[PDB]
Structure 1
Amino acid sequence: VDVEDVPSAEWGWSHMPIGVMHIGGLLSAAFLLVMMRGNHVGHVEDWFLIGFAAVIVALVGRNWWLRRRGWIR
């Protein structure tokens, strides 16, 4: 990172690669979706899992698209 983005960039670990966070988000979403497999008989929680996974996938996709298009760095 540049010091304009992280002022103490030369004092410590200041950069995490974006691929790590994108892949971690996708894997976390997939893990939310795999907990639909279980013994539970209700589906309220299935909808909560689907919604949280959808929000995560949308955030990852927005970030990836905006980095590709150059709007954020």
Structure 2
Amino acid sequence: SHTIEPEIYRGVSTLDEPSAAWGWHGLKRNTIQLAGWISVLFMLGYNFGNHKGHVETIWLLVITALLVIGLLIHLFEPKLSQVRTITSRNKPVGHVEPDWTYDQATLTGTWGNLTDSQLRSVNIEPSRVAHLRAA
């Protein structure tokens, strides 16, 4: 099907984000990194104040742990491979399904080679189709 070709603006490609020509898209990976890390430092600093409790500390520390593993997977992207198993009588990648419904409607293809008794069992008298089915 037809659609306009792709194009890139300030490194943001139009497919990943439309309107890249029309305004500030982007915000680069290194700056998200810097924001997260320096705000993680400001998170860790909160622990030092005059307070005596430790519900506060556990909140601060898990939120830092989550922000930190987030920043880690954002820096070291953990991609994975497409699976290539064939489970449970699935078919390999190159298969082409027929339209079973078109076959049932026109008595062709997968519905082509029905017997006399079978055509009779789908309420079609085989004289109705003997001329229409191929030689």
**How far apart, CA to CA, are the structure 2 residues paired with 1:56 and 1:23?**
12
| Shift, 1:29, TM fit | 1.2
TM-score, structure 2 normalization: 0.48
2:63 to 34, 52, 60: 52
**How far apart, CA to CA, are the structure 2 residues paired with 1:53 and 1:28?**
10
Name structure 2 gaps, 5 residues minimum: 1-11, 80-135
Hey, what does 2:84 align to over in structure 1? none
TM-score, structure 1 normalization: 0.87
Moved beyond 3 Å, runs of 4+: none
Asked if the contact 1:25/1:56 (under 8 Å) is kept, the reply is yes
1:8 maps onto 2:19 in alignment: yes
Hey, what does 1:38 align to over in structure 2? 49
Of structures 1 and 2, the larger Rg is shown by: 2
| Shift, 1:32, TM fit | 0.8
| Shift, 1:37, TM fit | 0.8
Q: Which has the higher contact order (CA 8 A, sep 6+)?
A: 1
SS in structure 2 at match of 1:16: coil
Q: Greater share of helix residues, 1 or 2?
A: 1
Identity among equivalent positions (%) equals: 32
Letter of the aligned partner of 1:12 in structure 2?
G
**How far apart, CA to CA, are the structure 2 residues paired with 1:54 and 1:30?**
12
Hey, what does 2:36 align to over in structure 1? 25
Hey, what does 2:3 align to over in structure 1? none
| Shift, 1:53, TM fit | 0.7
**How far apart, CA to CA, are the structure 1 residues paired with 2:40 and 2:69?**
10
The alignment covers a number of residue pairs equal to 68
Asked if the contact 1:29/1:52 (under 8 Å) is kept, the reply is no
Q: Deviations over 1:24-51 (max 9, x none)?
A: 1111111111101111100110110011
